[PDB]
Amino acid sequence: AQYEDGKQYTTLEKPVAGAPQVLEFFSFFCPHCYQFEEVLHISDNVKKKLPEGVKMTKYHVNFMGGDLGKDLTQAWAVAMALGVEDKVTVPLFEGVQKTQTIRSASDIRDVFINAGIKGEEYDAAWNSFVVKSLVAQQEKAAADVQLRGVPAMFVNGKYQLNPQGMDTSNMDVFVQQYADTVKYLSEK
Numbered sequence: 001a002q003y004e005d006g007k008q009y010t011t012l013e014k015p016v017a018g019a020p021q022v023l024e025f026f027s028f029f030c031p032h033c034y035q036f037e038e039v040l041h042i043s044d045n046v047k048k049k050l051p052e053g054v055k056m057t058k059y060h061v062n063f064m065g066g067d068l069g070k071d072l073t074q075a076w077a078v079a080m081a082l083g084v085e086d087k088v089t090v091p092l093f094e095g096v097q098k099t100q101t102i103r104s105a106s107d108i109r110d111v112f113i114n115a116g117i118k119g120e121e122y123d124a125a126w127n128s129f130v131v132k133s134l135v136a137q138q139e140k141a142a143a144d145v146q147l148r149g150v151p152a153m154f155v156n157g158k159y160q161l162n163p164q165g166m167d168t169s170n171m172d173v174f175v176q177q178y179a180d181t182v183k184y185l186s187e188k
Contacts, residue, residue: 019157
C-alpha cells in the first residue's frame, strides 16, 4: 500500500487507552525539535490538515537537559495553563539553542516576562497545583508510550510517526508528507 505499517509509521504493540488524538513530544534542548518547530513548522502544518474535531496536544519531556530540562517541562505547563504557547515557543527554543542565554529557571522566567506575562501571574502559575497536574499529565503521557526520544508524534495512542521513512531533499515536501500521514492515521 502507499502507507505501510513499519514505513511512514509504526504500530504500538501496547496501545494506550484514552490517549490524546494527536500527541506531539519535544524538548527545548532537542536539536531536531528546533528544526521541526522553527524551520519545518511541523505542528502547524499538521494542524492545518487535521480533520474536523481532532485536537492537537504538545508536551515537553524531562529526559534531556537535566535539571533545566525539568524546569522547562514545568515552564511548558505554565505556558499551557496561561495559553501563551505561541508567545514563548520561539524565544525558549532560541534561548536554549541559539543564544544559549537560558541557564536557569530565572532565565526561563525572563522569557515569559519579555513576552508580556506579568511576574506575579507567571509566579502564581509556576507554583500552582493546576500546573503541577499539567506537569503530571506530560509525564504520564510520555510514560504511557515508553518515550525515549524526541521529536515524536502519536495518533490515538496507537500509531507512532516514522519520519525516517521519508525524503528530506525538499523541506516543504517532507512536511506535507508528514502532515498527510498524520491525517491518514487520524482517519484510520
